[PDB]
Ligand binder design. Sequence first.
Ligand SMILES: CN1CCN(c2cnc3cc(C(F)(F)F)cc(-c4cccc(O)c4)c3n2)CC1
Length: 288
Amino acid sequence: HIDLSALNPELVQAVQHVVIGPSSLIVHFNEVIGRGHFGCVYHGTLLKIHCAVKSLNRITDIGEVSQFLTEGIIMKDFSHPNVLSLLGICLRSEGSPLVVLPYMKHGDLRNFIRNETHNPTVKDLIGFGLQVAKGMKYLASKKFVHRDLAARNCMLDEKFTVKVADFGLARDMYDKEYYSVAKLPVKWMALESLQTQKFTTKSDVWSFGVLLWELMTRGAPPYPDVNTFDITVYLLQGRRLLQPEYCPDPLYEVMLKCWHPKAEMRPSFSELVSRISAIFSTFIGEHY
Ligand SMILES: CN1CCN(c2cnc3cc(C(F)(F)F)cc(-c4cccc(O)c4)c3n2)CC1
C-alpha cells in the first residue's frame, strides 16, 4: 500500500502526461503473459487498445514511487518505430505500480525465429537485424547504453516490426538461464565488459553482432560449449562465432567487425544501418 497522498503535488503535475487513470485501464490478472524478477506481465485493455501491463513488485517506498514517476516522464519521450514505447504508468492505492506497454503479438524475437509455425526468409531475418540496428542507432543518439542486447530482449509486433525492449521501466531478468553470477549475459558481452564489467555503446555493438548471429542461425545458442570462465581466453585468442549457414558473406563480415577486440574500431550503429541496409537491399522480397 503506497501512500499516494504523500507524493509532492508539483511532481504529480509534471508527470501527468505519463499517467493513466485507474478508470482507463482493465488489467486481466487472470491472463498472465509472462514474468521477470521485478514483476509479472498481464494482458490489459487501455481506453480499446490491447496492452501489456507490468506490475513492478519491488517498488514499496514513497521515495521509490517518486523516482519511478520521474523515470516514466523521461522514458515516455523516447520515440522510434524500432524501440518499445511506454504507453504510461498507473498508480494504485493497493498493489504495486503498473507499467503500461504495447502488446507484442509475436513475443520475443528469439522465440519467434525458433517457432516452427513461422518461416521467415533470409531477407526477413536480415530485415529484423536492420530494424534492431535502427532502434539502437536511436538509443545511442540519446546516449542510452542498453547493456543487455540479445534476441530475447527484442519484441515483435503484429506487423513484424521489431522493437528493442528490456530497458527503462521494462528492464528485467526475464530468463535467468542466460546470465552468470550481479547476473551477467556472458555469451553476449564484449571482451572488455568481461574484463571490467563496464558497458558502453561500443559494447552494445558487440552484443548486436551476437544478436545478428542469433538471427541468421534462427536462434542457435552462442558458444554453448565454452564455459563462462573460459570465454575471455577464447575471445583473447581471436576466436569467434562461425558464419551461419544462410548468412551472406558481407553480413558475416559485419558481425566480425562488431567483435573487434578494440572497441574503438567497431562500427557505429549508424554505419551498421548503412551496411546492413545495403545488404538487405540486394534481396528481393514479395512486393519489393
Ligand atoms: C504467447 N505469447 C503471446 C505474446 N507474448 C507477449 C506479448 N507482448 C509482450 C509485451 C511485453 C512488454 F514488454 F511490452 F511488456 C512483454 C512481453 C513478455 C513479458 C515477459 C516475458 C515474455 O516472454 C514476454 C510480451 N509477451 C508472449 C507470449
